[PDB]
Amino acid sequence: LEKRMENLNKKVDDGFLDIWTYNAELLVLLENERTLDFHDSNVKNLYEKVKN
Amino acid sequence: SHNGKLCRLKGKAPLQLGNCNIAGWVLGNPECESLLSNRSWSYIAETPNSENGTCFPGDFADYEELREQLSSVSSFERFEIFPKERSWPNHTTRGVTAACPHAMKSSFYKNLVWLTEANGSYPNLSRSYVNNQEKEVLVLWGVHHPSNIEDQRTLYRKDNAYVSVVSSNYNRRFTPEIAKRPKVRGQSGRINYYWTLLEPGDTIIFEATGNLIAPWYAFALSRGPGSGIITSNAPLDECDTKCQTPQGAINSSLPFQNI
Amino acid sequence: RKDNAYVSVVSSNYNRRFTPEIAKRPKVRGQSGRINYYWTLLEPGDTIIFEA
Ligand SMILES: *[C@@H]1O[C@H](CO)[C@@H](O[C@@H]2O[C@H](CO)[C@@H](O[C@@H]3O[C@H](CO[C@H]4O[C@H](CO[C@H]5O[C@H](CO)[C@@H](O)[C@H](O)[C@@H]5O)[C@@H](O)[C@H](O)[C@@H]4O)[C@@H](O)[C@H](O[C@H]4O[C@H](CO)[C@@H](O)[C@H](O)[C@@H]4O)[C@@H]3O)[C@H](O)[C@H]2NC(C)=O)[C@H](O)[C@H]1NC(C)=O
Ligand SMILES: *[C@@H]1O[C@H](CO)[C@@H](O[C@@H]2O[C@H](CO)[C@@H](O)[C@H](O)[C@H]2NC(C)=O)[C@H](O)[C@H]1NC(C)=O
Ligand SMILES: *[C@@H]1O[C@H](CO)[C@@H](O)[C@H](O)[C@H]1NC(C)=O
């Protein structure tokens, strides 16, 4: 006789974990792109330093 | 953008309550007589303000838990748990009230039986039902709380009566409480409605010496993966969408909505 | 040895009256009778009173 509580606790536990899963995955892919562009900029600024 | 109209889901018509509540559907309200047939649905469509619920006044115990249990129910089989003629040889089952008028005459619930006296005596009651439907069975009853001791002695022939309803997972004893009450729908008495969900292979036992509104028809409930209760004022037409809101239906593959 | 019995369990934060309910019941583990189990958590320096 506490099904509204069981569904609410299930909603909280399956909403927080989905939000933090999305946050971790989104942070991983965004800083993967930032790393892959950061390395290209470090090679290009080295080439520009030797050119200058 | 939506249709603006209520739709069937995947070729399955919704259970439209119309003027009914969840309570008036399960109790078998005489205005809610179209819903009392063996059927399946995709969702339950209900009006935001519907008045045909419990016609006799009283407290529906754990109504919102019954709504949460019935949100995941896809179909029922309405079967006579206790027959009105066979199971009651020593009580007068022909009990109607003025709180539930059906075509301008007095009637009572189509799922419940108001037991009264027979030949000036109310005998002891012990009726057992064993679940052989292999599903969850919604058992529904009521306990009558009169307004004065004169109506209690008139109806049930004793001052002190009780109702005992014991399952394996249910154990509750009920005591009528005679008191002076405000009139709701012309009645100063109350029928308090209770419910339990029988397990497959479980036994319900109904014991009473008075004030029992016994079960007549029970609901053998079938669960489903996708179902719910939608509160909408939208009219239902012929429609075969896959997404359904209260405000209409959606036919697109777009990932988001703001309806 | 009596028709009407009671159990009264009173603490500072607990107050409940228990009445036995004799009824015809389904048999679970070979018994038609029930023992209803209750519990409470005493505070430090608190008094529990059992009356029956
Ligand atoms: C303050 O409140 C308290 C409680 O809240 C009040 O206490 C109550 O007072 C009333 C009124 O006096 C009492 O009712 C009486 O009960 C008597 C004993 O009952 C026994 O006999 C019954 C006989 O049954 C038959 O008669 C009744 C009508 O009386 C019919 O309904 C029935 O169908 C039968 O035909 C048994 O049924 C019962 O089980 C008991 O064994 C009655 O004898 C008494 O009847 C007298 O009065 C009638 C008119 O009302 C008259 O017709 C009769 O002939 C007879 O003279 C009456 O019903 C409550 O019992 C009592 N309750 C408690 C718990 O004590 C209190 O009065 C109130 N005080 C004030 C100042 O308001
Ligand atoms: C609605 O469903 C119930 C099932 O619970 C039907 O009751 C069965 O009816 C058949 C006869 O067609 C009997 O053989 C079964 O024993 C009944 N089962 C019970 C009472 O549990 C009921 O007839 C259906 N009503 C309809 C189709 O109008
Ligand atoms: C159903 O609702 C209508 C309108 O609110 C009302 O007039 C009627 O008495 C109701 N019927 C029952 C049985 O409650």
Side-chain angles (χ1 to χ4, degrees):
Chain A
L1 282 153
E2 283 184 344
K3 194 91 180 304
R4 291 176 297 168
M5 271 295 177
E6 186 185 273
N7 295 346
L8 181 62
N9 187 58
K10 195 204 316 299
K11 181 178 173 66
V12 166
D13 288 29
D14 297 7
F16 281 159
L17 264 48
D18 286 4
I19 282 158
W20 285 117
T21 301
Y22 165 74
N23 284 355
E25 286 180 346
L26 196 75
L27 192 49
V28 159
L29 281 71
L30 286 192
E31 311 286 290
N32 279 9
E33 271 156 292
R34 285 184 166 272
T35 293
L36 283 190
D37 300 355
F38 170 69
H39 283 301
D40 292 10
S41 68
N42 290 298
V43 185
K44 286 167 192 171
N45 297 347
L46 200 66
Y47 182 77
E48 279 290 323
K49 264 153 61 183
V50 177
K51 177 201 295 303
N52 287 6
Chain B
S1 198
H2 44 74
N3 290 138
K5 296 183 290 294
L6 194 75
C7 292
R8 314 156 55 131
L9 197 75
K10 297 181 227 320
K12 225 168 179 188
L15 187 150
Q16 192 154 330
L17 286 171
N19 44 16
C20 301
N21 283 16
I22 305 286
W25 166 39
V26 295
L27 287 178
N29 189 359
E31 317 273 8
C32 306
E33 50 171 331
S34 63
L35 303 150
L36 306 176
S37 295
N38 295 333
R39 79 184 54 188
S40 191
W41 60 88
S42 56
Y43 57 99
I44 298 153
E46 57 155 2
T47 309
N49 305 121
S50 45
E51 306 99 355
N52 288 162
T54 73
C55 45
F56 208 91
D59 288 331
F60 205 97
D62 292 324
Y63 179 43
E64 295 96 11
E65 286 282 339
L66 190 51
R67 178 208 181 82
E68 195 79 13
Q69 289 288 336
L70 261 53
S71 86
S72 53
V73 160
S74 285
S75 86
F76 59 93
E77 318 169 310
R78 201 164 151 264
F79 67 99
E80 205 167 7
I81 172 171
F82 292 133
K84 211 182 192 181
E85 279 80 33
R86 314 201 300 82
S87 279
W88 311 110
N90 288 316
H91 312 81
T92 48
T93 48
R94 320 295 150 179
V96 307
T97 184
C100 317
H102 182 68
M104 321 205 88
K105 71 179 284 294
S106 290
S107 185
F108 201 59
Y109 298 100
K110 301 286 101 176
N111 281 72
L112 310 179
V113 173
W114 198 337
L115 277 76
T116 59
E117 62 181 1
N119 304 317
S121 64
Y122 198 103
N124 291 350
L125 190 154
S126 176
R127 313 264 181 278
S128 310
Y129 168 70
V130 184
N131 200 359
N132 54 4
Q133 312 266 334
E134 285 137 358
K135 277 190 283 195
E136 263 170 335
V137 162
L138 172 62
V139 184
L140 290 159
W141 68 95
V143 173
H144 182 46
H145 303 273
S147 43
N148 47 3
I149 198 64
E150 312 200 72
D151 282 329
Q152 160 86 33
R153 292 214 214 87
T154 299
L155 285 154
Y156 307 111
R157 295 285 134 177
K158 54 179 67 66
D159 291 331
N160 304 307
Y162 79 97
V163 173
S164 178
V165 181
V166 184
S167 173
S168 298
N169 63 6
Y170 200 77
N171 195 0
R172 217 166 149 173
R173 195 160 160 280
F174 297 123
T175 303
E177 285 159 0
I178 294 92
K180 174 182 151 213
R181 296 192 207 85
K183 311 185 65 82
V184 174
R185 289 178 54 95
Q187 308 290 301
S188 283
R190 302 300 186 255
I191 293 178
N192 274 29
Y193 313 96
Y194 308 96
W195 62 274
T196 186
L197 268 175
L198 258 186
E199 283 287 272
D202 208 332
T203 311
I204 191 67
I205 305 194
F206 275 89
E207 297 215 305
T209 63
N211 302 69
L212 182 51
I213 312 301
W216 192 13
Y217 282 100
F219 299 93
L221 296 189
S222 301
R223 306 284 176 174
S227 190
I229 307 193
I230 277 163
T231 299
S232 48
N233 283 313
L236 172 58
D237 291 331
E238 175 60 49
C239 191
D240 193 359
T241 58
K242 328 175 181 183
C243 189
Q244 175 72 46
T245 66
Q247 273 166 309
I250 299 172
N251 49 2
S252 56
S253 181
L254 302 179
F256 304 117
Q257 65 182 177
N258 48 356
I259 296 168
Chain C
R1 295 283 140 174
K2 54 179 66 66
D3 197 356
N4 294 337
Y6 77 95
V7 174
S8 178
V9 182
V10 183
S11 173
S12 298
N13 63 6
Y14 200 80
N15 195 0
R16 268 193 74 152
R17 180 65 61 86
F18 309 104
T19 303
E21 284 159 358
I22 294 164
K24 174 182 141 213
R25 295 192 207 85
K27 311 186 65 81
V28 175
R29 290 179 54 95
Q31 308 290 301
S32 284
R34 301 299 186 256
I35 293 177
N36 273 29
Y37 313 96
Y38 310 96
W39 62 273
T40 187
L41 266 165
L42 292 174
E43 281 305 80
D46 201 349
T47 313
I48 186 73
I49 304 195
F50 277 92
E51 285 207 323

